[PDB]
Structure 1
Amino acid sequence: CTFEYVSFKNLREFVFKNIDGYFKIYSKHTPINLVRDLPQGFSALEPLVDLPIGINITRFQTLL
């Protein structure tokens, strides 16, 4: 509780990784014209944030 912070066509992609108590987030937002699957193609995610959480993670869940 030591930390707090504030700041189908819409495909949003993210990467979440934890290293040395930092939580690193990368992202990419794009239009698509497809439904069942991720489009066959390429672009790179770019860094959003690098948060000093100091906390252990082994499980996660998504909020609808």
Structure 2
Amino acid sequence: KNIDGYFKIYSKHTPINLVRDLPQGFSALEPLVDLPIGINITRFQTLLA
């Protein structure tokens, strides 16, 4: 997430045994790092090995 001129990152590493689909449950997302980037971001892509 990018807010108020800052670019923030969150994380979680929950272990699951149900491979099929999204598990019912509750994992909160802590703010991992905060950094003041601040860009009018409009697009999005991921990089796969």
Fold shared by both chains (TM-score > 0.5): yes
Q: Among all aligned residue pairs of Structure 1 and Structure 2, give the percentage whose two residues are the same amino acid.
A: 100
Question: Unpaired runs of 5+ in structure 2?
Answer: none
Q: What is the CA-CA distance between 1:56 and the residue it aligns to?
A: 1.5
**Secondary structure, counterpart of 2:12 in structure 1:** strand
Asked which structure has the greater RCO (Cα within 8 Å, sep 6+), the reply is 2
Give the superposed CA RMSD: 1.2
Equivalenced residues, count: 48
TM-score, length-normalised on structure 2?
0.79
Question: Unpaired runs of 5+ in structure 1?
Answer: 1-16
Whole-angstrom distance in 2 between the partners of 1:22 and 1:31: 30
TM-score, length-normalised on structure 1?
0.64
